[PDB]
Structure 1
Amino acid sequence: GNYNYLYRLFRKSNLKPFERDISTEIYQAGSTPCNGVEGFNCYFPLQSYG
């Protein structure tokens, strides 16, 4: 798995034409919204390409 390449999975909003989404934006992945809280329901922002 070439994990050097990754795809963003956490992104609160949409994107604009030619937007650098380098920022590791975090959005809830379970039930409790993150809202600045890390740990539960807040996984890695992006997933490696297996």
Structure 2
Amino acid sequence: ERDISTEIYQAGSTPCNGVEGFNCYFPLQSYGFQPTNGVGYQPYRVVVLS
């Protein structure tokens, strides 16, 4: 199932979306891995054959 919803994670104190206040971070974050990182931080082109 594909999910491309760009809403706000509504689970904190102040209700998100209806108003902007606290505990309303952005769900879709940006990664940022770099060659100077460790082995566990390197990306891998995972290909799943179903």
The TM-score with structure 2 as length reference comes to 0.36
- Larger fraction in strand: 1
The TM-score with structure 1 as length reference comes to 0.36
